[PDB]
Coordinates of C-alpha atoms in Angstrom, one line a residue:
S1 CA 0.0 0.0 0.0
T2 CA 0.8 3.7 -0.2
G3 CA -0.5 7.0 1.1
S4 CA -0.1 10.6 -0.1
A5 CA -1.4 13.7 1.7
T6 CA -0.9 17.4 1.2
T7 CA 0.7 19.4 4.0
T8 CA -0.1 23.1 4.3
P9 CA 1.6 25.9 6.2
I10 CA -0.5 27.2 9.1
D11 CA 0.4 30.8 8.5
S12 CA 2.3 33.2 6.2
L13 CA 5.6 32.4 8.0
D14 CA 5.5 28.6 7.6
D15 CA 5.5 28.4 11.4
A16 CA 4.3 24.8 11.1
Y17 CA 2.5 22.5 8.7
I18 CA -0.8 20.7 9.0
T19 CA -1.9 17.5 7.2
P20 CA -5.4 16.2 7.3
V21 CA -5.9 12.9 9.1
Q22 CA -9.1 10.7 9.2
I23 CA -9.8 9.2 12.6
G24 CA -12.6 6.8 13.4
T25 CA -15.8 5.5 11.8
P26 CA -17.4 7.5 10.4
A27 CA -14.3 9.5 9.7
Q28 CA -13.5 12.6 11.8
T29 CA -10.9 14.7 9.9
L30 CA -8.4 16.5 12.1
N31 CA -5.5 18.7 10.9
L32 CA -2.4 17.3 12.6
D33 CA 1.2 18.5 12.8
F34 CA 3.4 15.6 11.4
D35 CA 6.4 15.6 13.7
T36 CA 9.5 13.5 13.0
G37 CA 10.9 14.6 16.3
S38 CA 8.3 12.9 18.5
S39 CA 6.3 9.6 18.6
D40 CA 2.9 10.3 20.0
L41 CA -0.3 10.7 17.9
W42 CA -2.4 12.9 20.1
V43 CA -5.5 15.0 19.4
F44 CA -7.7 17.7 20.9
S45 CA -10.9 15.8 21.9
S46 CA -14.3 15.8 23.5
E47 CA -12.3 15.1 26.7
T48 CA -10.1 18.2 26.6
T49 CA -10.7 20.8 29.3
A50 CA -13.2 23.1 27.7
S51 CA -11.4 26.3 28.6
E52 CA -8.3 24.9 26.8
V53 CA -10.1 24.5 23.5
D54 CA -10.2 27.6 21.3
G55 CA -11.2 26.8 17.7
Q56 CA -9.6 23.4 17.2
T57 CA -11.4 20.5 15.7
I58 CA -12.0 17.8 18.3
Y59 CA -12.0 14.0 18.1
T60 CA -15.1 12.5 19.8
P61 CA -14.4 8.9 20.4
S62 CA -18.0 8.1 21.6
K63 CA -19.1 8.9 18.0
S64 CA -16.7 6.4 16.5
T65 CA -17.9 2.9 16.2
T66 CA -14.4 1.6 15.9
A67 CA -13.0 3.5 18.9
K68 CA -12.0 1.4 21.9
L69 CA -10.7 2.7 25.2
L70 CA -7.2 1.3 25.9
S71 CA -7.7 0.3 29.5
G72 CA -5.5 2.0 32.1
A73 CA -3.4 3.8 29.5
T74 CA -2.3 7.4 29.9
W75 CA 0.1 9.7 28.2
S76 CA 2.0 12.9 29.0
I77 CA 4.5 14.7 26.8
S78 CA 6.6 17.8 27.0
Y79 CA 8.3 19.3 24.0
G80 CA 11.5 21.2 23.5
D81 CA 9.6 24.5 23.0
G82 CA 8.2 24.2 26.6
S83 CA 4.7 23.1 25.5
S84 CA 2.9 20.0 26.9
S85 CA -0.2 17.9 26.8
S86 CA -1.6 14.7 28.5
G87 CA -4.6 12.4 28.6
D88 CA -6.0 8.9 28.0
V89 CA -5.8 6.6 25.0
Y90 CA -8.1 4.9 22.5
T91 CA -7.4 2.6 19.6
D92 CA -9.1 3.5 16.4
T93 CA -8.8 3.5 12.6
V94 CA -6.5 6.2 11.3
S95 CA -6.0 7.0 7.6
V96 CA -3.6 9.4 5.9
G97 CA -3.9 10.2 2.3
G98 CA -5.5 6.8 1.5
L99 CA -3.3 4.7 3.8
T100 CA -5.2 3.0 6.6
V101 CA -4.0 1.6 10.0
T102 CA -6.5 -0.2 12.2
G103 CA -5.9 -0.3 15.9
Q104 CA -3.8 2.9 16.0
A105 CA -3.2 4.4 19.4
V106 CA -5.0 7.8 19.4
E107 CA -4.0 9.7 22.4
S108 CA -6.9 11.9 23.5
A109 CA -5.9 15.1 25.3
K110 CA -7.5 15.9 28.7
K111 CA -5.1 18.8 29.2
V112 CA -3.0 20.9 26.8
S113 CA -0.7 23.8 27.5
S114 CA -1.4 27.4 26.6
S115 CA 0.5 27.4 23.3
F116 CA -1.6 24.6 21.9
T117 CA -4.8 26.3 23.0
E118 CA -3.6 29.5 21.4
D119 CA -3.0 27.9 18.1
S120 CA -6.5 27.2 16.6
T121 CA -5.0 25.7 13.4
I122 CA -3.3 22.6 15.0
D123 CA -5.7 19.8 16.1
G124 CA -2.9 17.6 17.4
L125 CA 0.4 15.9 16.5
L126 CA 1.2 12.8 14.5
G127 CA 4.6 11.6 15.7
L128 CA 7.0 10.0 13.2
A129 CA 10.2 9.5 15.2
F130 CA 11.0 6.1 16.6
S131 CA 8.4 4.3 18.8
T132 CA 10.9 4.0 21.7
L133 CA 10.0 7.7 22.5
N134 CA 6.2 7.1 22.7
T135 CA 4.9 8.2 26.1
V136 CA 2.0 5.9 26.6
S137 CA 2.1 4.2 30.0
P138 CA 2.1 1.4 31.2
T139 CA 2.3 -0.1 27.7
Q140 CA 4.2 1.9 25.1
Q141 CA 2.4 2.3 21.7
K142 CA 3.6 2.3 18.1
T143 CA 3.6 5.3 15.7
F144 CA 1.4 5.4 12.7
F145 CA 4.5 4.7 10.5
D146 CA 5.6 1.8 12.6
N147 CA 2.1 0.2 12.3
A148 CA 1.8 0.8 8.6
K149 CA 5.4 -0.2 7.7
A150 CA 4.9 -3.9 6.9
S151 CA 2.0 -3.1 4.6
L152 CA 3.8 -0.4 2.6
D153 CA 5.2 -1.1 -0.8
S154 CA 8.5 0.2 0.6
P155 CA 9.2 0.9 4.3
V156 CA 9.7 4.7 3.8
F157 CA 7.9 8.0 4.1
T158 CA 9.0 11.3 2.5
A159 CA 8.6 14.9 3.5
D160 CA 8.4 17.5 0.8
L161 CA 7.6 20.8 2.6
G162 CA 6.8 23.9 0.7
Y163 CA 8.1 27.4 1.1
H164 CA 5.1 29.6 1.6
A165 CA 3.2 26.9 -0.3
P166 CA 1.7 23.4 0.2
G167 CA 3.8 20.3 0.0
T168 CA 3.4 16.6 0.4
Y169 CA 3.9 13.7 2.8
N170 CA 4.1 10.3 1.0
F171 CA 4.1 6.9 2.6
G172 CA 5.4 3.8 1.0
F173 CA 7.0 5.2 -2.2
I174 CA 9.4 7.7 -3.5
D175 CA 8.0 10.1 -6.1
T176 CA 10.9 10.4 -8.5
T177 CA 9.3 13.5 -10.2
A178 CA 9.4 15.5 -6.9
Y179 CA 13.1 16.2 -6.8
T180 CA 16.1 17.0 -9.0
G181 CA 19.3 15.1 -9.3
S182 CA 19.8 12.2 -7.0
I183 CA 18.9 11.4 -3.4
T184 CA 22.0 11.2 -1.2
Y185 CA 21.5 8.8 1.7
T186 CA 23.3 9.2 5.0
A187 CA 23.5 7.1 8.2
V188 CA 21.1 7.4 11.1
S189 CA 21.5 6.8 14.8
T190 CA 18.3 5.8 16.5
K191 CA 20.0 5.7 20.0
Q192 CA 18.1 8.8 21.2
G193 CA 14.9 7.8 19.3
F194 CA 15.3 10.5 16.6
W195 CA 16.2 10.6 13.0
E196 CA 19.7 11.6 14.0
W197 CA 22.4 12.1 11.4
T198 CA 25.6 14.0 10.7
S199 CA 25.9 16.8 8.3
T200 CA 29.3 17.1 6.6
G201 CA 29.4 20.9 6.9
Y202 CA 28.1 24.3 5.7
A203 CA 28.6 27.4 3.6
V204 CA 27.2 30.9 4.0
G205 CA 26.0 32.6 0.8
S206 CA 28.7 32.2 -1.9
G207 CA 31.4 31.5 0.7
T208 CA 33.6 28.5 0.8
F209 CA 32.3 25.3 2.2
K210 CA 33.5 24.4 5.7
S211 CA 33.9 20.7 6.2
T212 CA 32.9 19.9 9.7
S213 CA 30.7 17.2 11.3
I214 CA 27.4 18.5 12.6
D215 CA 25.3 15.9 14.5
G216 CA 21.6 16.7 14.5
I217 CA 18.0 15.6 14.0
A218 CA 15.7 15.8 11.1
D219 CA 12.7 17.3 12.8
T220 CA 9.6 18.4 10.8
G221 CA 8.0 19.5 14.1
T222 CA 10.5 22.2 14.7
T223 CA 10.2 25.5 12.7
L224 CA 13.7 26.7 12.6
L225 CA 17.3 25.5 12.0
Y226 CA 19.2 25.2 15.3
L227 CA 23.0 24.9 14.8
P228 CA 26.2 25.4 16.9
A229 CA 26.9 28.9 18.0
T230 CA 30.1 29.1 15.9
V231 CA 28.1 28.3 12.7
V232 CA 25.2 30.6 13.5
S233 CA 27.6 33.5 14.3
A234 CA 29.3 33.0 11.0
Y235 CA 25.9 33.2 9.2
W236 CA 24.6 36.3 10.9
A237 CA 28.0 38.1 10.6
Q238 CA 27.1 38.3 6.9
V239 CA 24.0 40.3 7.6
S240 CA 24.5 44.0 8.3
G241 CA 23.0 45.0 11.6
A242 CA 22.2 41.4 12.8
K243 CA 22.6 40.7 16.4
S244 CA 21.8 38.2 19.1
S245 CA 19.1 39.6 21.4
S246 CA 18.8 38.1 24.9
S247 CA 15.5 39.9 25.3
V248 CA 13.9 38.6 22.1
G249 CA 15.6 35.2 22.5
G250 CA 17.8 34.9 19.5
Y251 CA 19.3 36.5 16.4
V252 CA 17.3 39.4 14.9
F253 CA 18.1 41.4 11.8
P254 CA 16.9 44.5 10.1
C255 CA 13.8 43.7 8.1
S256 CA 15.2 45.7 5.2
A257 CA 18.1 43.2 4.8
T258 CA 18.6 40.8 2.0
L259 CA 19.6 37.5 3.6
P260 CA 22.3 35.2 2.2
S261 CA 21.6 31.5 1.5
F262 CA 22.8 28.8 3.8
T263 CA 24.2 25.5 2.5
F264 CA 24.4 22.3 4.5
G265 CA 26.3 19.1 3.5
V266 CA 24.8 15.6 3.1
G267 CA 27.8 13.4 2.4
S268 CA 29.3 15.0 -0.7
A269 CA 26.0 16.6 -1.7
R270 CA 24.8 20.1 -0.9
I271 CA 21.4 21.4 0.0
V272 CA 21.0 25.2 -0.4
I273 CA 18.5 27.1 1.8
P274 CA 17.6 30.3 0.0
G275 CA 18.0 33.5 2.1
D276 CA 14.3 34.2 2.0
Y277 CA 13.6 31.0 3.9
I278 CA 15.5 32.4 6.8
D279 CA 13.2 35.4 7.3
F280 CA 10.6 34.9 10.1
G281 CA 9.3 38.5 10.0
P282 CA 8.9 41.2 12.5
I283 CA 9.6 40.3 16.1
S284 CA 6.3 42.1 17.1
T285 CA 3.6 43.6 14.8
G286 CA 4.9 46.7 13.1
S287 CA 8.5 46.3 14.2
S288 CA 11.4 46.7 11.7
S289 CA 13.4 44.1 13.6
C290 CA 12.9 40.7 12.1
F291 CA 13.5 37.2 13.6
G292 CA 16.1 34.9 12.2
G293 CA 15.4 31.4 11.0
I294 CA 18.8 30.1 11.9
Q295 CA 19.4 30.1 15.7
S296 CA 21.9 28.7 18.1
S297 CA 21.4 25.2 19.6
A298 CA 23.6 26.1 22.6
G299 CA 21.6 25.0 25.6
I300 CA 19.2 22.8 23.6
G301 CA 21.7 20.0 23.8
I302 CA 21.2 19.0 20.2
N303 CA 21.3 20.5 16.7
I304 CA 17.9 20.5 14.9
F305 CA 17.4 20.5 11.2
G306 CA 13.9 21.9 11.4
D307 CA 11.5 23.1 8.7
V308 CA 13.9 25.9 7.5
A309 CA 16.3 23.2 6.4
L310 CA 14.0 20.4 5.5
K311 CA 11.8 22.6 3.2
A312 CA 14.8 23.2 1.0
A313 CA 14.9 19.4 0.3
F314 CA 13.1 16.3 -0.6
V315 CA 13.7 14.1 2.4
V316 CA 13.4 10.4 2.6
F317 CA 12.9 8.8 6.0
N318 CA 13.9 5.2 5.3
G319 CA 12.6 2.8 7.8
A320 CA 14.4 -0.3 6.5
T321 CA 15.9 -2.7 9.1
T322 CA 18.8 -0.2 9.3
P323 CA 17.2 3.2 9.0
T324 CA 18.8 5.9 6.9
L325 CA 17.9 9.5 5.7
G326 CA 17.9 10.7 2.1
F327 CA 18.2 14.2 0.9
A328 CA 17.7 15.6 -2.6
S329 CA 17.5 19.1 -4.0
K330 CA 14.2 20.1 -5.6

């Protein structure tokens, strides 16, 4: 089998991407944030504290004839951005772009943190990291990809995120019309439960490529590109007036600037992030100071190849017996 679904930016800045997901019988369609940095499929629901729901679409398991309460199961998650959610668990039928999993763990939120409430466009998350990170207790549950894998034509999914435009998540096949040149594959460590890999280096604008190992994760659920302080300083030094602001919480730059591109290495291959992808707009409405899309990972503890990086590429998440990651230009 295969599946194919369009993924759409939630706002004009590409702050995140939502993908429609069918849950239950009859189908209840929710718009979920596909997150290769986590491993829980959780949803706003009829069980969510009412004051914590503000415009989201909810899953109502009592209206699904295929929903079954997973007895005694609970979940609770906290994300790198400080947000969190928790609740109970059902199994139900879940379909993405034509691909159906029966008996998928659907984690129903009883509580969500303020940032989730405040974002009316995201109805929940669909985790696509390794199932070892799944938070369900006392019996850990599998991701949608893990459950579908054996049935897929090929044990892969691909992320093709758009810049200020829709893109595509495919399951089970590689669309050879969706990228240019070849796909370069690179080794993955699953030891931390992430799609963790090592970039071979970087360049800033038309500058010379610096060969240096950068270990990090391919994370569709993180907006920005988080890299070592040395790398980030080298980038922003090429932007007149750019500075790191402790009060704002990262590098900012004059909104009048033209940003240079940023290149990262995948083996001997090179992925070029155009400068415009690195502009996240005014720090507050009407400001002429703009927030940068490349930021320091110092104090995160890990480098994160988030949407800023991934949207410059066609990315293969290869879930073969030994997982690997593939990147192509597009």
